[PDB]
Design a protein around this ligand. Structure first.
Ligand SMILES: CCCCCCCCCCCCCCC[n+]1ccn(CC(O)(P(=O)([O-])O)P(=O)(O)O)c1
Lengths: 334, 334, 334, 334, 334, 334
């Protein structure tokens, strides 16, 4: 087989410590299509995150990235990010992208283009409102869920409905993105970047960096809970999306990340550790550990289990305690 | 939508730890039917267990419980139990109960009726013979297995045979109940509760309480092993029962508790720790770690594995050693 | 139940503390067929391992073992091996063997016939080339995989294509055997048994036993990694074989031993402990704990994770470093 | 959808009156893969059949045809055959060939390379021995059967065995080819083409053209039956091949041609009309009409029906009568 | 077996010449559900077609038809159609309707209600724009498709996804309706009813009746081909819808009507006989004879076969030729 | 491989123009078991029908036929029948019979034993009542269906139920036999054979032979219709039997003859030709021309359409018209 495709899977394993295995487990055509999708996305993300690239220089690269997929010799050699290897050897990745069936190239290129537009659009401004937060998450993750969904339908491995329902697919992305943003608060603060919606933290402190100051630990945990509360609103759509899947390999690929995300929100809920160091995922409830995330009823059980971990811990004092219980209740009676 | 249905699910998660998540993961009509069935059973249980309610008041409550389901305003405000909330706000629960398709009401009402009669019967006595132990377990657990089964069949998510074969359904309940009774010897002794068959424990000591005395530990373990051998006899029926389920959400619901009970019996066998406190369930073998309880073949293997954990520990000096091997031998060959 | 059949399952559990459970979970006729097949193989294996039986007396026993299946009174009372009970009470075993439907009998007799010839051939000599290693594994393990596959097809539980593809069925056996031979180095040394191919370890030390001397540890690990690299080559065939299976009970039976063999290889890689005693099997990330080994996509994911575990610990200086990377690369990509 | 792909399918329907339909019905990837494979083979046949091409310009074209697939601009404008359009717009066809997954490209390219050899090799010489007749058919039909089988397996829609067993794939081709060659006796003669094996007809006349001559009819029908008996030998392999198929779209694609071919050999057997004109595709018995060629058992029954239809019309007179009855006996008892 | 159900099946066979057989072949509960669903639709249609009915008296009948199903004594004796029996004995029909499971009644009732509205809405209105043609069709045929899909899922013989996909379920109906409307020109003409979209025929003649006039055959044909081209646009959804089906009985039920519709569009395309009467169904050949319409690949082969017959007969003259090739090309390629 | 087994299939194709094809298409062990079964029955039938054999001598031959299977040298040289060949070379067939598994031999021997008894019993009488018509058919046909059904269940390709439900299996044979007896009236009459039940035909004419005389043509047809109506009664059981089969090869073997019988009755209904010559099957129809007889839903549809073809031709004045409409109505509603 192609040695360039082997190089691609090497990059996938280098850049995805967690999902390389389940991506490689996808049946037939989706395997390479998703591996390449992941890689071009990692290249785009590396370009977005690289702070040694001024905004004026970066915008045209984000805007035209989707077209670089068709420039056999294009590569980027000035990146200082950890995964700069995918940009420097981008010709190897784009070569394999161009070997994918055209119907997949069309989907992936379309996604990359729109993602570029949104990313550029967000280089000179922080996230203000929650509506803006959803817009940003849509661009960096929602679109990925939409892209992947359109590939599942185009491959016929899933029902045509999966790719058409862009809202449910967008939700899969928004749930994971918000979860990572919430969990990575401290890391992003030392990195010099702010993603938490300004309209939300500006009501607890005046500098998002303030949640790093112990004298505001309580105020932080309250804002933390408000965002987690905001994230939980996507679960109904996550369940609906997962319930339409019928291909086992695709189901594992989609379900596992969502379960991990919910497990993360659970561990972070009302946890002061989010503002000190890493939050190690609390592990196992007798029943959750009895099943895995490979069949829909089990995934539901696991999700509901984690729901309870949050509910049974909602403090009365918490300013969001009522909104938290409400959404968890709405999810339970779905 | 219903504020009452959301309230029922709130109580479910509040009062249920081992079934809340799996109950919510059930398909269609079974979801609400089992949720409410669990709440009405939880209410009856709370009454049955409240020792501040005199026998004079308790007998009529148990006997008539089933009709309270149809008395819109019925409720009980004198319970001193932890879950008393389901009794005080029973109208909400019964409201949702009368809301179920008539066929489910038939099942739930019939079970509460027979359950109330049986419980009322044991308020003044302890379990003597092994025949009375089955009888007692049948009233508090077997009937529940039979009710759930009849509900699965009524919903049509499972074949009629499931609800029809009451003996197998009964064994499902007896196996869980006998396992809990055996495991909680000490926790119950400290609570003034006795459930071990007197006809059995009397052959070792003059009082059931003596098994808590360090000098009778050897006799306690012989009694312990004998009771466990007794429980093992239900396994063939448990396997026959689970092997007939076609619906995944139902399978998950029924299999998990059974496997957990089996692991408990295995962890308790010939273990002095049963009489010193709460016995820890040592993990499984490499093969059990490789599979979960979500498909029948996997459950059989898990069950057969825990059976060998017991077989491997049977000491020739134990007075039940021979009977313990026989039932396990029989289970292996079927 | 048959007392003789009850006895076979007693022996099955006595000699197979790990596979007995999955064998007993096989659907219908495969259950007894595989049980008996395992016991006759265990008997044949015990004859081969017994060093108190001279070569001239062992050769006839191995060559004619297949016909004894049809001699009701045949047994062997001189073995001193741990599982000698299957030989001393073989009449009970061959009895249940003659009870199986003829289509299973034919496959089992054929495999024992061919296996006996192969075992006899290696009684005198030691494994020289890697090609001979393959031949020896083919005889003691590959034929078993082939026999089993034919038993799955005959029963109609698996498609006839499973039984027809002898190449991959053979690979299934070679992978398990090579893993066991690799892991059991020390144990085989302290037993006067040599299974590592000579044309391989001779390039590292003068006597295979030298690997047991701490001053050769570095050399022992290099040879270890070379053999492990060799075994990894069977994985593609293992994945292809497992992917063709349709019956759940058969899939569980076939996939679990493979995953465990892979976990083992992952643990032993570049591990000095292999040459000092036993190796403690660790365990990986959530993807591993979020899914079990009962569906193909999940088995693939588990295998890919263990592959990365080895890939990540590959030392540049290792003489097989490149080959290890390329075989793992092939598995990842294709 | 690419304009070039639409054009490819437009050509498919132009050049394939009786098949574009079942090719367009193939699942997923096999669709375009077989469409293009058919088109390129069409272009190669157009060159091999175009007598307005000097043998020295042709031989190199047939030999290097396989490499033009990678040359974007290659084309041929001097063809005057009816399907001159595929050569004239080959760039469009080669473009889509290069968009196929690499694993399909290598299969198609390899087959054209080898096919180009055999064709050039038989550009000047007619078929002499029967051995040569198989060689000839292998080069123009067998390899196509082998090529398709490798595509079927590489797509994973069919088992790995379908692609590996080249002899069986080869036979599917030989059978169709010999059948058409037999049926097309006259047309070939009224066109200067001689495909019937010389070493066989030379025993009936002096010039293969003498079969059209009315007085030699008896010897003609005698020769015709001998060839038909020769073709019948491929049936066992054809049944074996079809028996391994599991994908319905592939099964329809493979089965129809073989059944139509077998039906043809039955209509031409001991039929004088073969030397007077084209023969009609005679129906059959009430069956067939009541069984489609959509499931292997049905196809088997249909084949036997036609076998018997032939067997019956076997005159003791004919010199091949012995061999004909023999092969049909083998086919029916197998 | 009730005599009212027997009577319904008598009516079924009376009013449905070529579909009673396939309806009777439907598995389990779908059998009676569709038989009954077909009869209520016959009734409601008999009313909409009856002209001796006051438009102002007809409207209310259409609007309340859905409720008549629940009025035991309801019936209509003033109708003067051929299928008036289903109206005069509606109580026998509604009676059986009320015997259907609740879940099926809900669907059939709901569809009849929405259908009733649309039918009324078009009484004093002709078909103008093509979008209106789709609205009318959606009301008389489209909703029928949606109802059936819902019944399939409700019965659980088809995946819930079948019911959800209302758009493709609707296209199924539109395809059949446009086909009959196009084919039944003359008859409807000599009946006083106009269904062909005004915006379409107007661009050819002043009065839709003109096409009946011999001197306009040409203009008539062109308008014909343009409408046919309109209907062809539904094949992609048809193919997609049928591909999702998993139950054999349901497949036959949905596929057959679709195939015949296409076999009609082919027969009629560019054929003057359409205006001079009712054209015949006159075959296909070869690859067809080898396949019924009981498996997706065969239905695709059949569909593409007819698509070809239309494509070949496309007059270079026709003002829609281009659009005709464009859609047939998209159907071929995609 | 066997020269004798070769000869057996040779005879199977000379003595079975209606079952050879589908028998030879049976899976695995059923193939030879059935071929052999059909050959012994063939021989047994050749004895019973031979009139050159005195009754005095024929009785012993029919009673001990089941025993001749175990007499390697048994044969009959004095047969004058057309298929005498199977009796003269019976050892060749008895030889193969003895090569079959025992369970298959048990079935063929038993049926051959019970079949010899009934045939002998009818050597002296003609069929009187309709009850005696079922009895005669039971011995010569019903038992063949029962035998075959048991063979299917012993080979395990079908569940035990197929062989257990002797009633349904008997109805299969009765439908075919009655159909054949009805169709072969004339042929039989000219051969001096009479199978029509006297209690039925004596109500029309004085002697069964009178239906051969042209003046009795109308009376003959009415009797014909009454007999056809009788036979139709077995169709519900035919459908039940066919629908519970799961092996495709068995399904085809069972469905095809039945559908053939149904088509024949439909062709013979109210047809005067029955009494002048042989009737030709006018099968097919636009809708069924889209189906074959290889899947249950299709077989049901095909059967139903044939029922309608009959229902449509029922003469009002026909004395059995009521009964005919009744059975057909029942078949429609079941
Ligand atoms: C599961 C359904 C089983 C249905 C079994 C129906 C059995 C009907 C009675 C058959 C007994 C075996 C007769 C073998 C010899 N025989 C008797 C009559 N025939 C006539 C024929 O040779 P054949 O119909 O091929 O079997 P024909 O081609 O002239 O129709 C042949």
């Amino acid at each position: 087989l192609s040695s360039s495709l082997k190089t691609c899977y090497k990059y996938l394993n280098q850049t995805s410590r967690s999902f390389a295995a389940v991506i490689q487990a996808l049946d037939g055509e989706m395997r390479n299509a998703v591996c390449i999708f992941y890689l071009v996305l990692r290249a785009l993300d590396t370009l977005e995150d690289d702070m040694t690239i001024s905004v004026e220089k970066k915008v045209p690269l984000l805007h035209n990235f989707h077209s670089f997929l068709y420039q056999p010799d294009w590569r980027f050699m000035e990146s200082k990010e950890k995964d700069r290897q995918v940009l420097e050897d981008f010709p190897t990745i784009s070569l394999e992208f161009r070997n994918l069936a055209e119907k997949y190239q069309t989907v992936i290129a379309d996604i990359c283009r729109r993602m570029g537009i949104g990313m550029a659009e967000f280089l000179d401004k922080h996230v203000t409102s929650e509506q803006e937060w959803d817009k940003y998450c849509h661009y960096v993750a929602g679109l990925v869920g939409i892209g992947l969904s359109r590939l599942f339908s185009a491959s016929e491995f899933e029902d045509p409905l999966v790719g058409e329902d862009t809202e449910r697919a967008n939700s899969m992305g928004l749930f994971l993105q918000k979860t990572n943003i919430i969990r990575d608060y401290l890391e992003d603060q030392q990195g010099g970047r702010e993603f938490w919606p300004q309209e939300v933290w500006s009501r607890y402190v005046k500098k998002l960096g303030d949640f790093a100051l112990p004298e505001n630990i309580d105020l932080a945990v309250q804002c933390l809970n408000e965002l987690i509360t905001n994230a939980l609103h996507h679960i109904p759509d996550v369940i609906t999306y997962l319930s339409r899947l019928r291909n086992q390999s695709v189901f594992n690929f989609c379900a596992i990340p969502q379960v991990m995300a919910i497990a993360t929100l659970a561990a972070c809920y009302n946890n002061q550790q989010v503002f000190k160091g890493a939050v190690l995922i609390r592990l196992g409830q007798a029943v959750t550990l009895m099943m895995d995330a490979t069949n829909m009823p089990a995934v539901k059980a696991i999700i509901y289990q984690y729901m309870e971990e949050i509910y049974h811990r909602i403090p009365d004092s918490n300013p969001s305690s009522s909104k938290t219980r409400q959404i968890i209740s709405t999810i339970r009676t779905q």
